[PDB]
Amino acid sequence: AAQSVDIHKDQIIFSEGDAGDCAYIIEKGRVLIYLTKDKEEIPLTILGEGEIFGEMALIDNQNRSASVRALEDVRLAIVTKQQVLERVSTADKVVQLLMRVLLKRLRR
Amino acid sequence: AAQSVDIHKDQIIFSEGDAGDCAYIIEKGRVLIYLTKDKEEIPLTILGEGEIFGEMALIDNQNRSASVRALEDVRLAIVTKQQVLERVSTADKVVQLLMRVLLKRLR
């Protein structure tokens, strides 16, 4: 059962270093991917509706490489490891094979 | 129109260094992925029916990182950038987004 959550403007959705198991697809609003060094916000990217972030938690098994803050109220679809497996297994044969070898290459 | 090609036993399908625009799915036979150093064949992998290789040509169009020889008569399905785009565009939303970030990261 796919799930969604609301997060309010200016909330940090997650931070550089956090453990994470899931990715997020933006259904509403916008987020800023940023790092921080020195006590200084260094922005990388702004993402809006239809876009995914947090994806490396679904692939590898490390921590968040960047922090993400909501620039406005957001509604996020939670993508889990289980859902990925399920969707990939129902997908087109060629798309399957491609995802599977691309996923392997990205792992390392 | 999807296309296939027959490659005879011992034909080099492509080589380390070649420009390439497509990937292949093996419908028949087997192929050896190899490198060569000092005129010495160093085998990596044997691939057979149902498997894909050459996939990086669909990602970045830099040259082949390994050579591939048919060990026996093969039939390969040609996978083009256009076909991938078409299938990706009909696919599940989550599968779409995922493909798209794999392509982004592996360039």
Residue numbers in the entry:
A (entry chain A): 4 to 111
B (entry chain B): 4 to 110
From the paper:
Herein, we provide high‐resolution structures for an EAL enzyme Bd1971, from the predatory bacterium Bdellovibrio bacteriovorus, which is controlled by a second signaling nucleotide, cAMP. We reveal that regulation of c‐di‐GMP hydrolysis arises from a domain‐swapping of the “regular” cNMP fold, which undergoes significant rearrangements upon binding of stimulus, communicating a series of conformational changes over 40 Å to license a productive state at the EAL dimer interface. C‐di‐GMP turnover was increased ~8‐fold in the presence of cAMP or cGMP, further supporting the proposal that cNMPs are activators of Bd1971.
The structure of the Bd1971ΔEAL construct was determined to 2.45 Å resolution, enabling us to trace residues 4–111 of the sensor‐hinge–C‐helix region of the protein. The Bd1971ΔEAL structure reveals that the relationship between the cNMP body and hinge/C‐helix dimer interface has changed relative to that of the full‐length cAMP‐bound form, such that the apo/bound structures can be superimposed on one of these elements but not both. Alignment of the bound and apo‐forms using the C‐helix interface (residues 97–110 of both chains) reveals that the cNMP body rotates ~50° relative to the plane between the C‐helices. Residues 81‐86 spanning the connection between the cNMP body and hinge helix comprise the fulcrum for this motion (identified using DynDom; Girdlestone & Hayward, 2016, labeled “cNMP link” in Fig 6B and C), resulting in the largest translation between apo and bound structures occurring at the distal end of the fold (the β‐hairpin element of the cNMP body shifts 25 Å, as depicted by an arrow in Fig 6A). The concerted rotation and translation of the cNMP fold places the outer face of the β‐sandwich (strands 1, 3, 6, and 8) into an orientation that would sterically clash with the linker helix of the opposing chain in the cAMP‐bound full‐length structure.
